[PDB]
Coordinates of C-alpha atoms and ligand atoms in Angstrom, one line a residue:
Chain A
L1 CA -0.3 -0.1 0.5
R2 CA 2.9 2.2 -1.0
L3 CA 0.6 3.3 -3.5
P4 CA 1.8 6.5 -5.7
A5 CA -1.7 7.6 -8.4
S6 CA -4.2 4.5 -8.5
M7 CA -8.3 5.3 -7.9
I8 CA -9.8 1.7 -6.6
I9 CA -8.4 -1.0 -4.8
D10 CA -10.2 -3.6 -3.3
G11 CA -12.8 -3.3 -0.4
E12 CA -12.9 -7.1 0.0
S13 CA -11.8 -8.8 -1.5
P14 CA -15.0 -10.5 -3.8
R15 CA -13.0 -11.7 -5.7
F16 CA -14.0 -12.8 -9.2
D17 CA -12.4 -13.0 -12.7
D18 CA -14.5 -14.8 -15.8
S19 CA -16.1 -12.2 -17.6
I20 CA -13.2 -11.1 -19.4
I21 CA -11.6 -13.8 -20.8
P22 CA -11.9 -14.7 -24.5
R23 CA -13.0 -18.4 -23.5
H24 CA -15.0 -18.9 -27.0
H25 CA -12.6 -18.4 -30.0
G26 CA -11.3 -22.0 -29.2
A27 CA -7.5 -22.4 -29.3
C28 CA -4.9 -20.0 -30.5
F29 CA -1.7 -21.7 -31.6
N30 CA -0.6 -18.3 -33.3
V31 CA -1.2 -14.9 -31.9
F32 CA -2.7 -12.4 -34.7
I33 CA 0.2 -10.0 -35.2
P34 CA 0.1 -7.1 -37.6
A35 CA 1.7 -7.4 -40.8
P36 CA 5.7 -8.0 -41.8
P37 CA 6.6 -5.1 -44.9
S38 CA 7.5 -8.4 -46.7
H39 CA 6.8 -6.0 -49.3
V40 CA 10.4 -6.0 -51.0
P41 CA 10.8 -4.1 -54.1
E42 CA 13.4 -6.6 -54.6
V43 CA 16.2 -4.6 -56.1
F44 CA 18.9 -6.0 -57.8
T45 CA 22.2 -4.1 -56.7
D46 CA 25.3 -4.8 -58.2
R47 CA 28.0 -6.0 -58.8
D48 CA 28.8 -8.6 -56.5
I49 CA 27.7 -8.5 -52.9
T50 CA 24.2 -11.2 -54.2
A51 CA 25.6 -13.6 -51.8
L52 CA 26.4 -11.5 -48.9
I53 CA 22.8 -9.8 -49.1
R54 CA 21.4 -13.2 -49.5
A55 CA 23.6 -13.9 -46.8
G56 CA 21.7 -11.3 -45.0
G57 CA 18.5 -12.9 -44.9
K58 CA 19.8 -16.6 -43.8
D59 CA 20.7 -18.0 -40.2
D60 CA 24.0 -20.1 -41.2
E61 CA 26.9 -20.2 -38.8
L62 CA 29.0 -17.0 -38.4
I63 CA 31.8 -18.3 -39.6
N64 CA 30.0 -18.3 -43.4
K65 CA 29.7 -14.0 -42.7
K66 CA 33.2 -13.7 -42.9
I67 CA 35.2 -10.0 -44.3
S68 CA 38.3 -8.8 -43.5
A69 CA 38.0 -5.0 -43.3
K70 CA 40.2 -4.9 -46.7
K71 CA 36.8 -5.7 -48.3
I72 CA 34.9 -3.6 -46.3
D73 CA 36.6 -0.3 -46.7
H74 CA 36.8 -1.0 -50.3
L75 CA 33.3 -2.7 -51.4
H76 CA 31.9 0.8 -49.1
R77 CA 31.4 2.6 -52.6
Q78 CA 28.0 0.9 -53.0
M79 CA 27.6 -1.0 -49.7
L80 CA 26.4 2.8 -48.6
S81 CA 24.1 2.7 -51.4
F82 CA 22.5 -0.8 -50.6
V83 CA 21.7 0.7 -46.5
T84 CA 20.8 3.9 -47.8
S85 CA 18.8 2.9 -50.4
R86 CA 15.3 4.3 -50.1
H87 CA 13.7 0.5 -51.3
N88 CA 14.1 -2.4 -48.6
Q89 CA 14.6 0.1 -45.8
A90 CA 11.4 -0.8 -42.9
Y91 CA 11.7 -4.6 -44.2
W92 CA 15.4 -5.1 -42.8
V93 CA 15.0 -3.0 -40.1
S94 CA 12.1 -5.4 -39.2
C95 CA 13.7 -8.7 -39.7
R96 CA 16.9 -7.1 -37.5
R97 CA 14.7 -6.0 -35.4
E98 CA 13.0 -9.0 -34.2
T99 CA 15.9 -11.2 -34.1
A100 CA 17.3 -8.8 -31.8
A101 CA 14.8 -8.6 -29.6
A102 CA 15.3 -12.4 -29.3
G103 CA 18.2 -12.8 -28.7
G104 CA 21.3 -14.3 -27.2
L105 CA 23.9 -12.7 -26.7
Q106 CA 26.5 -14.4 -29.0
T107 CA 24.5 -12.9 -31.8
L108 CA 24.4 -9.5 -30.6
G109 CA 27.6 -9.1 -30.0
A110 CA 28.1 -10.3 -34.2
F111 CA 25.8 -7.7 -34.3
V112 CA 27.6 -4.6 -32.5
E113 CA 31.0 -6.2 -34.4
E114 CA 29.4 -5.1 -37.5
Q115 CA 27.4 -2.1 -36.7
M116 CA 31.1 -0.7 -35.1
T117 CA 32.7 -1.8 -38.5
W118 CA 30.3 0.0 -40.5
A119 CA 30.4 3.3 -38.6
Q120 CA 34.2 3.6 -38.9
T121 CA 34.1 3.0 -42.4
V122 CA 31.7 5.5 -43.1
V123 CA 33.5 8.2 -40.5
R124 CA 36.3 6.8 -42.0
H125 CA 35.2 8.1 -46.0
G126 CA 33.9 10.4 -44.6
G127 CA 30.9 11.8 -43.0
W128 CA 29.3 11.7 -39.2
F129 CA 25.9 11.0 -38.7
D130 CA 22.7 13.8 -39.8
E131 CA 19.9 14.3 -37.4
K132 CA 18.8 12.1 -39.0
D133 CA 20.4 10.4 -42.1
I134 CA 18.4 7.1 -43.2
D135 CA 21.0 4.2 -42.4
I136 CA 19.9 0.4 -41.8
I137 CA 23.0 -0.3 -39.6
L138 CA 23.0 2.4 -37.1
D139 CA 19.1 3.3 -37.4
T140 CA 18.7 -0.5 -35.6
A141 CA 21.9 -0.1 -33.6
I142 CA 19.5 1.3 -30.5
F143 CA 17.6 -1.6 -30.9
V144 CA 20.9 -4.0 -30.6
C145 CA 22.2 -2.2 -27.6
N146 CA 19.3 -2.1 -25.4
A147 CA 19.2 -6.1 -26.2
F148 CA 22.5 -6.3 -25.9
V149 CA 22.8 -5.3 -22.2
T150 CA 19.2 -6.5 -21.3
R151 CA 20.1 -10.7 -22.6
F152 CA 23.7 -9.3 -20.7
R153 CA 21.9 -8.8 -17.3
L154 CA 20.9 -12.7 -17.3
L155 CA 24.6 -13.5 -16.3
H156 CA 25.2 -14.3 -12.5
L157 CA 27.3 -11.2 -12.3
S158 CA 28.2 -11.1 -8.7
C159 CA 30.1 -13.9 -9.5
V160 CA 31.6 -13.3 -12.9
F161 CA 32.7 -9.7 -11.9
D162 CA 34.1 -10.7 -8.6
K163 CA 35.8 -6.9 -8.0
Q164 CA 34.4 -4.3 -5.3
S165 CA 33.3 -1.1 -7.1
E166 CA 33.5 -2.7 -11.3
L167 CA 30.5 -5.1 -10.7
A168 CA 28.4 -1.6 -9.4
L169 CA 29.0 0.6 -11.8
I170 CA 27.9 -2.7 -14.5
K171 CA 25.2 -3.5 -12.7
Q172 CA 24.1 0.4 -12.3
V173 CA 24.7 1.0 -16.2
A174 CA 23.1 -2.3 -17.5
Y175 CA 19.8 -1.1 -15.3
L176 CA 20.1 2.1 -16.6
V177 CA 19.9 0.8 -20.2
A178 CA 17.4 -1.8 -19.2
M179 CA 15.4 0.5 -18.3
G180 CA 15.5 2.2 -21.6
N181 CA 14.1 5.9 -20.7
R182 CA 17.8 6.5 -18.8
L183 CA 19.9 5.8 -21.4
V184 CA 21.7 9.4 -21.9
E185 CA 22.6 9.1 -18.4
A186 CA 23.9 5.8 -18.4
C187 CA 26.2 6.9 -21.4
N188 CA 27.1 9.9 -20.0
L189 CA 28.2 7.9 -16.3
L190 CA 30.5 5.9 -18.8
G191 CA 32.5 8.7 -19.4
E192 CA 33.8 10.1 -16.1
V193 CA 35.1 6.8 -15.1
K194 CA 38.7 4.6 -14.8
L195 CA 38.3 2.1 -17.7
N196 CA 40.8 -0.2 -17.1
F197 CA 38.9 -2.8 -16.7
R198 CA 37.3 -5.2 -19.2
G199 CA 33.5 -5.3 -18.7
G200 CA 32.9 -1.1 -18.5
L201 CA 35.3 -1.2 -21.8
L202 CA 33.1 -4.0 -23.2
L203 CA 29.8 -1.8 -22.4
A204 CA 31.8 0.9 -24.1
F205 CA 31.8 -1.0 -26.6
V206 CA 28.3 -0.9 -27.1
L207 CA 27.0 2.5 -26.0
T208 CA 29.5 3.5 -29.0
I209 CA 27.0 4.1 -31.9
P210 CA 24.2 4.9 -30.2
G211 CA 26.0 7.4 -27.8
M212 CA 27.1 8.8 -31.0
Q213 CA 23.1 9.0 -32.5
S214 CA 22.4 11.1 -29.3
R215 CA 25.9 13.1 -29.0
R216 CA 23.6 16.4 -28.3
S217 CA 21.9 15.8 -24.8
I218 CA 24.8 14.4 -23.2
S219 CA 28.2 15.4 -21.5
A220 CA 31.3 17.3 -22.5
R221 CA 33.2 14.0 -21.5
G222 CA 31.3 11.2 -23.5
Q223 CA 31.7 12.7 -26.8
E224 CA 35.5 12.4 -26.5
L225 CA 35.1 8.7 -25.1
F226 CA 32.6 7.5 -27.7
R227 CA 34.8 9.1 -30.8
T228 CA 37.8 7.9 -29.3
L229 CA 36.3 4.0 -28.7
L230 CA 35.1 4.4 -32.3
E231 CA 38.6 5.9 -33.5
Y232 CA 40.7 3.1 -31.9
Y233 CA 37.9 0.2 -32.4
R234 CA 39.1 -3.1 -34.3
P235 CA 36.6 -5.8 -35.4
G236 CA 36.5 -8.8 -33.5
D237 CA 37.2 -6.8 -30.2
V238 CA 33.6 -7.0 -28.5
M239 CA 33.3 -10.6 -29.1
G240 CA 36.9 -10.9 -27.9
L241 CA 35.7 -8.9 -24.5
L242 CA 32.7 -10.9 -24.2
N243 CA 35.0 -14.5 -24.8
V244 CA 37.4 -14.0 -22.5
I245 CA 35.3 -12.7 -19.9
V246 CA 33.5 -16.0 -20.2
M247 CA 36.5 -18.1 -20.8
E248 CA 38.4 -17.2 -17.6
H249 CA 35.7 -17.1 -15.1
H250 CA 34.5 -20.5 -16.2
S251 CA 37.9 -22.0 -16.1
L252 CA 37.9 -21.1 -12.1
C253 CA 34.3 -21.1 -11.2
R254 CA 32.2 -24.6 -11.5
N255 CA 28.8 -23.2 -9.9
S256 CA 25.8 -24.4 -10.9
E257 CA 23.8 -21.8 -11.6
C258 CA 26.1 -19.2 -13.0
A259 CA 27.5 -22.0 -15.5
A260 CA 23.8 -22.2 -16.3
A261 CA 23.2 -18.7 -16.0
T262 CA 25.9 -17.6 -18.5
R263 CA 25.1 -20.7 -21.0
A264 CA 21.3 -19.4 -21.3
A265 CA 22.5 -15.7 -21.3
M266 CA 24.5 -16.4 -25.0
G267 CA 22.4 -18.8 -27.3
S268 CA 23.7 -20.0 -30.1
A269 CA 25.2 -18.3 -32.5
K270 CA 23.8 -19.7 -35.6
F271 CA 20.7 -17.3 -35.6
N272 CA 21.7 -14.3 -37.7
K273 CA 18.5 -13.2 -39.8
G274 CA 19.6 -10.3 -40.9
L275 CA 23.4 -9.8 -40.3
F276 CA 24.9 -8.8 -42.9
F277 CA 28.5 -9.5 -42.6
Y278 CA 30.4 -10.3 -39.4
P279 CA 34.2 -8.8 -39.4
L280 CA 37.6 -9.9 -39.2
Chain B
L1 CA 27.1 13.5 -11.6
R2 CA 26.1 11.9 -8.6
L3 CA 28.1 8.8 -8.1
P4 CA 27.6 7.0 -4.3
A5 CA 30.1 5.0 -4.0
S6 CA 33.6 4.6 -6.1
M7 CA 37.4 4.7 -5.5
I8 CA 38.6 6.4 -8.5
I9 CA 37.3 9.1 -10.9
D10 CA 39.4 10.0 -13.6
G11 CA 40.1 14.0 -13.7
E12 CA 43.8 13.2 -16.0
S13 CA 42.3 11.3 -18.8
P14 CA 44.5 8.8 -19.6
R15 CA 43.8 6.3 -23.0
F16 CA 43.1 3.8 -24.1
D17 CA 43.8 1.1 -23.0
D18 CA 44.5 -1.8 -25.4
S19 CA 46.1 -3.9 -23.1
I20 CA 43.3 -4.9 -21.8
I21 CA 41.5 -6.4 -24.7
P22 CA 42.9 -10.4 -25.8
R23 CA 44.0 -8.9 -29.6
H24 CA 45.8 -11.9 -30.1
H25 CA 43.6 -15.3 -30.2
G26 CA 42.0 -13.7 -33.0
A27 CA 38.3 -14.7 -34.4
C28 CA 36.1 -16.0 -32.7
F29 CA 32.8 -17.5 -33.9
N30 CA 31.4 -19.4 -30.7
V31 CA 32.1 -18.2 -27.3
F32 CA 33.5 -20.7 -24.8
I33 CA 30.2 -21.4 -22.9
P34 CA 30.7 -24.4 -20.4
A35 CA 29.4 -28.1 -21.0
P36 CA 25.6 -28.8 -21.5
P37 CA 24.2 -31.3 -18.9
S38 CA 24.5 -34.8 -20.8
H39 CA 21.2 -35.9 -22.0
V40 CA 20.7 -39.7 -23.9
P41 CA 20.5 -42.3 -20.7
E42 CA 16.7 -41.7 -21.4
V43 CA 14.4 -43.2 -19.1
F44 CA 13.1 -46.3 -21.1
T45 CA 9.5 -45.0 -20.6
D46 CA 7.1 -46.4 -22.0
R47 CA 3.6 -46.2 -23.6
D48 CA 3.3 -43.1 -24.0
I49 CA 5.4 -40.0 -22.6
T50 CA 8.1 -41.1 -25.3
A51 CA 6.0 -39.1 -27.7
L52 CA 5.4 -36.5 -25.4
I53 CA 9.1 -36.8 -24.1
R54 CA 10.3 -36.5 -28.1
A55 CA 8.0 -33.2 -28.2
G56 CA 10.7 -31.9 -26.1
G57 CA 13.8 -32.5 -28.1
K58 CA 12.2 -30.8 -31.4
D59 CA 11.1 -27.4 -32.2
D60 CA 8.0 -27.9 -34.0
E61 CA 4.8 -26.0 -34.4
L62 CA 2.4 -25.1 -31.6
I63 CA -0.3 -27.6 -33.0
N64 CA 1.9 -30.1 -33.5
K65 CA 2.5 -30.4 -29.7
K66 CA -0.8 -29.7 -28.8
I67 CA -3.5 -32.3 -25.8
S68 CA -6.5 -31.9 -24.4
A69 CA -6.6 -31.5 -20.6
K70 CA -8.8 -34.6 -20.2
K71 CA -5.8 -36.5 -21.5
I72 CA -2.8 -35.0 -19.2
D73 CA -5.3 -35.7 -16.5
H74 CA -5.6 -39.7 -17.5
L75 CA -2.1 -39.9 -17.7
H76 CA -0.6 -38.4 -14.6
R77 CA 1.0 -40.9 -12.4
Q78 CA 2.4 -41.7 -15.7
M79 CA 3.8 -38.3 -16.7
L80 CA 4.7 -37.0 -13.0
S81 CA 7.2 -40.2 -12.9
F82 CA 8.8 -38.7 -15.8
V83 CA 9.1 -34.9 -14.8
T84 CA 10.4 -36.1 -11.3
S85 CA 12.4 -38.6 -12.4
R86 CA 16.2 -38.9 -10.7
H87 CA 18.3 -38.9 -14.0
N88 CA 17.8 -36.4 -16.6
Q89 CA 17.1 -32.9 -14.3
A90 CA 19.3 -30.5 -15.3
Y91 CA 18.9 -31.2 -19.2
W92 CA 15.8 -30.7 -19.1
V93 CA 15.8 -27.7 -17.4
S94 CA 18.3 -26.8 -18.9
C95 CA 16.4 -27.0 -22.0
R96 CA 13.7 -25.0 -20.6
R97 CA 15.5 -22.4 -19.4
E98 CA 17.7 -21.3 -22.5
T99 CA 14.7 -21.4 -24.9
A100 CA 12.7 -19.1 -22.7
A101 CA 15.3 -16.9 -21.8
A102 CA 15.6 -16.7 -26.1
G103 CA 12.3 -16.9 -27.1
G104 CA 9.4 -14.4 -27.8
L105 CA 6.4 -14.1 -26.2
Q106 CA 4.8 -16.6 -28.4
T107 CA 6.5 -19.3 -27.0
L108 CA 6.5 -18.1 -23.4
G109 CA 2.8 -17.3 -23.5
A110 CA 3.0 -21.4 -24.4
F111 CA 5.3 -22.6 -21.1
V112 CA 2.7 -20.0 -19.5
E113 CA -0.2 -22.4 -20.3
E114 CA 1.7 -25.9 -19.5
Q115 CA 3.2 -25.6 -16.5
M116 CA 0.2 -23.8 -15.2
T117 CA -2.3 -26.4 -16.5
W118 CA 0.5 -29.0 -15.1
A119 CA 0.5 -27.7 -11.6
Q120 CA -3.2 -27.1 -11.9
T121 CA -3.5 -31.3 -12.5
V122 CA -0.6 -32.2 -9.7
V123 CA -2.8 -30.5 -7.4
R124 CA -5.8 -31.7 -8.3
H125 CA -4.5 -35.3 -7.2
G126 CA -3.2 -34.1 -3.7
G127 CA 0.0 -32.6 -4.9
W128 CA 1.4 -29.6 -3.6
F129 CA 4.5 -27.2 -4.2
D130 CA 6.8 -28.7 -2.3
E131 CA 10.3 -27.5 -1.9
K132 CA 12.1 -28.9 -3.4
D133 CA 10.5 -32.3 -4.8
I134 CA 11.8 -32.2 -8.2
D135 CA 9.3 -31.1 -11.1
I136 CA 10.9 -30.1 -14.4
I137 CA 8.0 -27.6 -15.1
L138 CA 7.5 -25.8 -12.0
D139 CA 11.6 -25.3 -11.5
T140 CA 11.5 -23.4 -15.2
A141 CA 8.5 -21.6 -13.5
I142 CA 10.5 -18.5 -12.3
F143 CA 12.4 -18.6 -15.5
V144 CA 9.0 -18.4 -18.0
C145 CA 7.7 -15.3 -16.0
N146 CA 10.4 -13.8 -15.6
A147 CA 11.4 -13.8 -19.2
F148 CA 7.7 -12.8 -20.4
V149 CA 7.4 -9.6 -18.7
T150 CA 11.2 -8.6 -19.8
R151 CA 10.2 -9.5 -23.4
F152 CA 6.4 -7.9 -22.6
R153 CA 8.8 -4.7 -21.6
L154 CA 9.3 -4.1 -25.2
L155 CA 5.8 -3.3 -26.5
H156 CA 4.5 0.4 -26.6
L157 CA 2.4 -0.1 -23.8
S158 CA 1.6 3.9 -23.6
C159 CA -0.5 3.3 -26.9
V160 CA -1.7 -0.5 -26.2
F161 CA -3.7 0.4 -22.6
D162 CA -5.2 3.4 -22.9
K163 CA -6.2 4.6 -19.1
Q164 CA -3.0 6.0 -17.5
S165 CA -4.0 3.5 -14.6
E166 CA -4.3 0.3 -15.5
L167 CA -1.0 1.4 -18.0
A168 CA 0.8 2.0 -14.3
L169 CA -0.1 -0.9 -13.0
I170 CA 1.5 -2.7 -15.8
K171 CA 4.5 -0.5 -16.3
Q172 CA 5.4 -0.7 -12.6
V173 CA 4.3 -4.3 -11.7
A174 CA 6.7 -5.2 -15.4
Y175 CA 8.9 -2.5 -13.5
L176 CA 9.8 -5.0 -10.3
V177 CA 9.8 -8.6 -12.1
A178 CA 11.7 -7.7 -15.2
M179 CA 14.6 -5.4 -13.0
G180 CA 15.5 -7.0 -10.1
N181 CA 14.2 -10.0 -8.0
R182 CA 11.8 -7.5 -6.3
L183 CA 9.3 -10.0 -7.7
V184 CA 7.5 -10.5 -3.9
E185 CA 6.4 -6.7 -4.4
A186 CA 5.6 -7.4 -7.7
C187 CA 2.9 -10.1 -6.3
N188 CA 2.1 -7.8 -3.2
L189 CA 0.8 -5.1 -5.8
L190 CA -1.1 -7.3 -8.0
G191 CA -2.9 -8.7 -4.3
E192 CA -4.1 -5.3 -3.6
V193 CA -5.4 -4.2 -7.0
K194 CA -9.1 -5.4 -8.8
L195 CA -8.4 -7.3 -11.7
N196 CA -10.8 -6.6 -14.2
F197 CA -9.1 -5.6 -16.9
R198 CA -6.6 -7.6 -19.3
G199 CA -3.4 -6.7 -18.5
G200 CA -3.3 -7.1 -15.0
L201 CA -5.1 -10.5 -15.3
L202 CA -2.6 -11.6 -17.5
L203 CA 0.5 -10.8 -15.6
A204 CA -1.0 -12.0 -12.6
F205 CA -1.8 -15.3 -14.4
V206 CA 1.6 -15.4 -15.4
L207 CA 2.9 -15.0 -12.2
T208 CA 0.6 -17.3 -10.2
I209 CA 3.2 -20.0 -10.5
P210 CA 5.9 -18.2 -9.1
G211 CA 3.4 -16.8 -6.5
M212 CA 2.1 -20.2 -5.3
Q213 CA 6.1 -21.3 -4.8
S214 CA 6.5 -17.9 -3.1
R215 CA 3.3 -18.0 -1.0
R216 CA 4.8 -18.0 2.7
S217 CA 6.5 -14.2 1.6
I218 CA 3.3 -12.6 0.1
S219 CA 0.6 -10.9 1.4
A220 CA -2.4 -11.9 2.4
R221 CA -4.2 -10.9 -0.4
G222 CA -1.5 -12.4 -2.8
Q223 CA -2.0 -16.2 -1.4
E224 CA -6.0 -16.0 -2.1
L225 CA -5.3 -14.2 -5.2
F226 CA -3.4 -17.0 -6.7
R227 CA -5.3 -19.7 -5.1
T228 CA -7.9 -18.7 -6.6
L229 CA -6.4 -17.8 -9.8
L230 CA -4.9 -21.5 -9.8
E231 CA -7.8 -23.2 -8.9
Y232 CA -10.5 -20.9 -11.7
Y233 CA -8.0 -21.5 -14.4
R234 CA -8.8 -22.9 -17.4
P235 CA -6.2 -24.0 -20.3
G236 CA -6.0 -20.6 -23.1
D237 CA -6.7 -18.2 -20.7
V238 CA -3.3 -16.7 -21.3
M239 CA -2.6 -16.9 -24.9
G240 CA -6.4 -15.8 -25.4
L241 CA -5.6 -12.4 -23.5
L242 CA -2.5 -11.8 -24.7
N243 CA -4.3 -12.6 -28.8
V244 CA -6.8 -10.4 -27.8
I245 CA -5.3 -7.6 -26.5
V246 CA -3.0 -7.3 -29.6
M247 CA -5.9 -8.4 -32.2
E248 CA -8.4 -5.7 -30.5
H249 CA -5.8 -3.2 -30.5
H250 CA -3.8 -3.2 -33.9
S251 CA -7.5 -3.6 -35.2
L252 CA -7.1 0.2 -34.8
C253 CA -4.0 0.9 -34.1
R254 CA -2.2 1.4 -37.6
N255 CA 1.0 2.8 -35.9
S256 CA 4.1 2.1 -38.0
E257 CA 6.5 1.6 -34.8
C258 CA 3.6 0.5 -32.2
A259 CA 3.1 -2.7 -34.2
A260 CA 6.6 -3.0 -35.0
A261 CA 8.0 -3.5 -30.9
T262 CA 4.7 -5.9 -31.4
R263 CA 6.1 -7.9 -34.1
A264 CA 9.3 -7.8 -32.6
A265 CA 8.3 -9.1 -29.3
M266 CA 5.8 -11.7 -30.0
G267 CA 8.3 -13.6 -32.7
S268 CA 7.4 -16.5 -34.1
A269 CA 5.8 -19.7 -32.5
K270 CA 8.4 -22.3 -33.9
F271 CA 10.3 -22.3 -30.8
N272 CA 9.6 -23.8 -28.1
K273 CA 12.4 -26.7 -27.3
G274 CA 10.9 -28.4 -24.6
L275 CA 7.7 -28.0 -24.9
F276 CA 6.3 -31.0 -23.7
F277 CA 2.6 -30.3 -24.6
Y278 CA 0.4 -27.7 -25.4
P279 CA -2.9 -27.7 -23.3
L280 CA -6.3 -27.4 -24.7
Ligands
LIG1 ZN1 30.6 -18.0 -11.7
LIG2 ZN1 -0.7 1.2 -30.6

């Protein structure tokens, strides 16, 4: 009965419940969800990302989505076209959004790798994020970040980070992002902090792109941080950090629910729709 | 800004650091998670819960896993001799844990329907929520409930639920369940308020089993609420409410992002391993 703002609470309780449940529609094996943007103008782009876009529609192993960054800054010539193509826009965003929601940290990590590598390329070849220019990868970047942090909290963090205050910051940042409403305070708290440790740097790596997309309502130190992070970023980093963190702790901690919560928190990597490229 | 507990702020602003990142392992495609529980001893069961079990090893469509409440009422002492088997425990709990952990609201709704129907049955034959007496479906009940609500938080609830009071309840209850282990506070809150709307009744339906497993720590209203909710529930209620909220909303809310979040959060129902039965 610590209730801000409600009006009618029960005075008995009576209590009853039957009327509102639709018991007459019978079984329901599928929920009547709105239609997807299945409509694809089916634009054929050139000259040979055909297999790369078809890979952006499959769920192969990550081992089948490799590109060395040499190719990325090379084929950027019209990869920027495909991503900014006014055709097929909300479709890929929807596809990539529906997978980012669910789930498994391995998948979301690879997504961050791709979106970090892409953004580092599109600032290398000139051009910062307008307010706001249309672009598939960066438009889903915020969805990737939130879903990453949220599926991240399902780790036994009290066990993985056997550190005093590191765990405190990580817990608060993961909290701030997980409530959705408060990102500017999550990504600006990251900034006036030490980042010697791994886990906080891993979160800062994730909040790079969305920290940049919001670089107007944030602190002064934040912009310096995320621009530095994107500048000195390299591919395979986020997966490296995440991997070595889980590797070492579970090389030691042979608990039960810790190994379980970890095993659950990162599902298989097979699920990729719609992942275009895994950078290396 | 305000930082309660920390040891070293930064005035200096050092960089980067690059040594903390293990840049020498190279390429990572599968994170090195601990081993999965070993299945394949199997229990030599027998007509005909094998067919039921085998449905727990496959990602079939919901309709292919259907069952009638009259059947699982008949098939009880048999089915109970499996879910309470000495062997193959943490395996099936892991399968269910990881699936609900990734899966979307449709998958989790099926799990909820199953576990509620199962608890109804084992109660109907004198059983009770022992702690612990090893019931696969009731162990996973916490993970299902949590993950359901954590993903329920993806919908544009400000657009799905009109009156600010019902919405406010849904938002706070979701905040408690999803964020932290403040579960008992949530069950108390559901216990206070009259549930004559589909949002609160749906969530309360989800939390019945974890509430009934926390019967000692929960307020009087909570104990009576979840007792009655467990007795008067009849299969389909959860999906029926979930569906009918979506259906009746998006039949007049053609908002691009509201339907986008709804599509992303629901997710396909083909993923359900291991879902033993979908009750009717
Ligand atoms: Zn551990
Ligand atoms: Zn709406």
